[PDB]
Amino acid sequence: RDEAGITGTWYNQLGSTFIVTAGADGALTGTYESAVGNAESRYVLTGRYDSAPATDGSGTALGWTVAWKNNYRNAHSATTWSGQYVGGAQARINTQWLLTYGTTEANAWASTLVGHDTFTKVK
Amino acid sequence: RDEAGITGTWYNQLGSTFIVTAGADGALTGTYESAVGNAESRYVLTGRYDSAPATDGSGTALGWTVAWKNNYRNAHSATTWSGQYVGGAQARINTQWLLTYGTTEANAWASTLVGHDTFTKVK
Amino acid sequence: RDEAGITGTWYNQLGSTFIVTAGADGALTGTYESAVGNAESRYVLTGRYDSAPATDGSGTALGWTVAWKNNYRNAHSATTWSGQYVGGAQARINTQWLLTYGTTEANAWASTLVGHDTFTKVK
Amino acid sequence: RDEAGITGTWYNQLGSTFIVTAGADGALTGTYESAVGNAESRYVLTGRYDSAPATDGSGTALGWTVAWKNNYRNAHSATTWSGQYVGGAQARINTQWLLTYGTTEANAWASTLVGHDTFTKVK
Ligand SMILES: O=C(CCCC[C@@H]1SC[C@@H]2NC(=O)N[C@@H]21)NCCN(Cc1ccccn1)Cc1ccccn1
Ligand SMILES: O=C(CCCC[C@@H]1SC[C@@H]2NC(=O)N[C@@H]21)NCCN(Cc1ccccn1)Cc1ccccn1
Ligand SMILES: O=C(CCCC[C@@H]1SC[C@@H]2NC(=O)N[C@@H]21)NCCN(Cc1ccccn1)Cc1ccccn1
Ligand SMILES: O=C(CCCC[C@@H]1SC[C@@H]2NC(=O)N[C@@H]21)NCCN(Cc1ccccn1)Cc1ccccn1
Ligand SMILES: [Cu+2]
Ligand SMILES: [Cu+2]
Ligand SMILES: [Cu+2]
Ligand SMILES: [Cu+2]
């Protein structure tokens, strides 16, 4: 599959670092370090990927989650990235993400940010 | 924390079933069964939640991922849910989600659907 | 078409008020009053809708924009709602929205909130 | 304001062409031509922008809508772009978008795609 292509260290356009291991069963496990926001050091991440993707040139669907609490900081929030891995000489993981932070019910309408990250193997 | 409140079986407005266990360390593990789409039976899910949320009445941020492959079907896609758990007599998990499916590079602009699910303990 | 069904006053789950006129050519024009956020009184809105929708029971696609500046307040932001109108005894406009606020380049990753509003003719 | 900076022709990363006029009152009017999808030729667009943005280096919030019907084609859908204009030697409009297409109630969960476009004055 793409187990070998996905496993490793990835970097996004903000300078964040995404370290992941893809399991034969579709599991994703690793750590995430964000260059921006209320974050410092590494955070636990877990997710899933399609371990038997199509063979027609389509990308490989995947997703993962980080809750922004570690031994140093708690930002009472979590981000999920949803996207596809695209292999080749210039491999990429193209994603869109949702960041939800805890709010009161009255402020819940404003609880979720949306964005997009592109991860590459270099930089 | 909310370990006890989150762990259990949840149902969304489509009739889907979300079975999860919240760990003391912030882990989420379980299965998901969707009432709609290219899905049948249960799928593995993993995620994270804030295990030390604020005590001011704010919700508890969390997220999880399902890759839509199991022993019966493969839809070459994955969904991530991002949201917050709100406890009380009428406990809820209010979420927004991103569903990415594998595509060629030319069709990648159309690869991601967005929606929102509300999960309750009843129905 | 749905010109007659769309034109009028609509209310969402937050208590906001959406007053719109649908033109024969696909134009939407009106005002929006939000019950939440950095808003007060009415704001100008403009948008578009499908003036020749399918006749198979499908909804009618539409969208509109509000920039949050009026004679009283400026929140340096704009929201776009994208969705479909569903006619009948219990007519609805089901939407998802994106709220972008002006930021510096360093904070741009956090510039956009996402949510969902359901509008009805009553309440 | 940014009336002069916004008005003109813009191009995104797909090769689409966005022609807009910014009014002194905050109005946006023009045409959109998409290089991808069920689209051909030009489509009417309308939107709004912040006509008195902050003067601290922040971007200028804006949004617009296209319903995908013209004299040649109807795709029973509409897209809204939400974002901010960033002036300078390399001016940009950075956006995220929501594309909703008409569906039956049973398929409504799958009615909305999400993406992101960056518009520049060249290419
Ligand atoms: O900033 C974070 C955690 C780090 C997010 C980095 C994102 S993930 C997507 C993108 N990709 C990256 O690599 N990095 C960024 N959470 C915001 C939580 N706060 C809301 C918020 C929203 C916007 C700006 C600041 N805060 C609430 C709060 C609770 C307590 C204290 C302080 N704040
Ligand atoms: O339908 C699925 C998996 C189930 C999703 C259920 C969602 S998750 C969010 C929401 N909440 C729920 O409880 N249920 C729904 N994936 C679509 C993958 N296909 C694209 C697609 C998009 C829209 C409609 C149908 N297909 C691509 C494809 C690859 C091979 C074969 C067939 N199709
Ligand atoms: O609140 C607004 C305008 C009203 C939005 C109501 C939304 S639209 C979608 C939903 N549906 C509704 O009917 N109502 C809500 N804009 C936020 C702009 N600010 C960021 C921001 C983000 C979150 C919370 C507060 N502020 C930036 C800023 C610039 C200057 C001063 C103050 N603030
Ligand atoms: O493709 C369109 C209109 C053009 C969209 C271009 C987007 S806008 C955002 C991005 N930025 C750009 O510059 N271009 C792209 N609408 C899809 C409507 N159809 C669903 C759909 C979804 C995915 C792929 C194809 N179709 C439904 C349908 C109704 C009748 C017939 C055929 N199809
Ligand atoms: Cu914060
Ligand atoms: Cu499918
Ligand atoms: Cu504000
Ligand atoms: Cu189509």
Residue numbers in the entry:
A (entry chain A), B (entry chain A), C (entry chain A), D (entry chain A): 12 to 134
From the paper:
Our group develops artificial metalloproteins (ArMs) using biotin–streptavidin (Sav) technology to mimic natural metalloenzyme active sites to characterize otherwise elusive intermediates and study the effects of the secondary coordination sphere on metal ion(s) reactivity. This approach leverages the strong binding affinity between biotinylated metal complexes and the Sav host to confine synthetic metal cofactors within a protein scaffold. By engineering ArMs with aromatic residues within their secondary coordination spheres, we systematically investigate the influence of these residues on Cu reactivity and oxidant activation. Our results demonstrate how the inclusion of aromatic residues within the secondary coordination sphere influences the structure and reactivity of copper ArMs.
We reasoned that a tyrosine mutation at position S112 would be close enough to our Cu cofactors to influence the structure and reactivity but would not be oriented to participate in direct coordination. To prepare this type of Cu ArM, a triple mutant variant of Sav, referred to as 2XM-S112Y-Sav, was engineered; this mutant contains S112Y and two additional mutations, K121A and E101Q, which we have found to prevent unwanted interactions with our artificial metallocofactors (S3 and Table S1†).21 We also utilized CuII-biot-et-dpa as our cofactor to assemble our ArMs, where (biot-et-dpa) is bis(2-pyridylmethyl)amine. One of the remaining coordination sites is occupied by an O atom donor from an acetate ion originating from our crystallization conditions and bound in a κ1-manner – this ligand is also H-bonded to a water molecule within the secondary coordination sphere. The final coordination site is occupied by an O/N donor from the N49 sidechain, which undergoes a conformational change to produce a previously unobserved rotamer. Although protein crystallography cannot unambiguously discern the identity of the coordinating atom of the N49 sidechain (i.e., either O or N), we modelled the bound state as O-bound based on the pH of our crystallization conditions (pH = 6), which was below the pKa of the amide.
